[PDB]
């Protein structure tokens, strides 16, 4: 069973604004998503200090980044602490509607969209690049979800039928058409080590064929 949902307005704003302003550095998605990763990964390690079973679900604590140039899909796969499905449909476990007035505001004083992420709704930036978003996610706390959606002012959620990840959260970039250089091994490279140097967790870049 499929879920529909209307996005609330700022965030419907926010995403129409990133899918259409005129933007050249399209690659800050990549560090926002990673970013997020990071985030998680640190909340599942926190969590764990006090009870060890939470990792239960899985010891390793990495970032993955998988290209697949035939189905025009660049996959970013965390093994942090997952999100619930209310996480989800509250907008993926942000305060996305104050988050996008402090944004899409201080875009007007003297701000870029690269900064985004100091907002708390980097997450968006996939647009930049993406038609569609798929979010795959499991908590420990409950079961697997996907969430989706190609804007347009909705997202769907529903029970994941898919591979169980065991714990953590996948985020899946249907790219648009003339974005693909995000699928390239060296673009790739590129873009981590100059934005994604420090984070504290192992970036694998899968390779393809
Ligand atoms: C929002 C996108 C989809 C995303 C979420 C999670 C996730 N799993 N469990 C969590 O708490 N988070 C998370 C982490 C950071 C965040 C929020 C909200 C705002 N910031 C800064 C939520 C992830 O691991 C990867 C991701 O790309």
């Given at each position: 069973?499929?879920?529909?949902?209307?996005?609330?307005?700022?965030?419907?704003?926010?995403?129409?604004?990133?899918?259409?302003?005129?933007?050249?550095?399209?690659?800050?998605?990549?560090?926002?998503?990673?970013?997020?990763?990071?985030?998680?990964?640190?909340?599942?390690?926190?969590?764990?200090?006090?009870?060890?079973?939470?990792?239960?679900s899985?010891?390793?604590?990495?970032?993955?980044?998988?290209?697949?140039?035939?189905?025009?899909?660049?996959?970013?796969?965390?093994?942090?602490i997952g999100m619930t499905k209310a996480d989800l449909i509250?907008?993926?476990?942000?305060?996305?509607?104050?988050?996008?007035?402090?944004?899409?505001?201080?875009?007007?004083?003297?701000?870029?969209?690269?900064?985004?992420?100091?907002?708390?709704?980097?997450?968006?930036?996939?647009?930049?690049?993406?038609?569609?978003?798929?979010?795959?996610t499991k908590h420990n706390d409950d079961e697997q979800y996907?969430?989706?959606?190609?804007?347009?002012?909705?997202?769907?959620?529903?029970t994941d039928?898919?591979?169980?990840?065991?714990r953590?959260?996948?985020?899946?970039?249907?790219?648009?058409?003339?974005?693909?250089?995000?699928?390239?091994?060296?673009?790739?490279?590129?873009?981590?080590?100059?934005?994604?140097?420090?984070?504290?967790?192992?970036?694998?870049?899968?390779?393809?064929?």
């Amino acid at each position: 069973e499929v879920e529909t949902f209307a996005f609330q307005a700022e965030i419907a704003q926010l995403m129409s604004l990133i899918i259409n302003t005129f933007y050249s550095n399209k690659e800050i998605f990549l560090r926002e998503l990673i970013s997020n990763s990071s985030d998680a990964l640190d909340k599942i390690r926190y969590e764990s200090l006090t009870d060890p079973s939470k990792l239960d679900s899985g010891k390793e604590l990495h970032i993955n980044l998988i290209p697949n140039k035939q189905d025009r899909t660049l996959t970013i796969v965390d093994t942090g602490i997952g999100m619930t499905k209310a996480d989800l449909i509250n907008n993926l476990g942000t305060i996305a509607k104050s988050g996008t007035k402090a944004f899409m505001e201080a875009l007007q004083a003297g701000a870029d969209i690269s900064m985004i992420g100091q907002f708390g709704v980097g997450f968006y930036s996939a647009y930049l690049v993406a038609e569609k978003v798929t979010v795959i996610t499991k908590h420990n706390d409950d079961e697997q979800y996907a969430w989706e959606s190609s804007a347009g002012g909705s997202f769907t959620v529903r029970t994941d039928t898919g591979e169980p990840m065991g714990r953590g959260t996948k985020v899946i970039l249907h790219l648009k058409e003339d974005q693909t250089e995000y699928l390239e091994e060296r673009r790739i490279k590129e873009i981590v080590k100059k934005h994604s140097q420090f984070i504290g967790y192992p970036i694998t870049l899968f390779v393809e064929k």
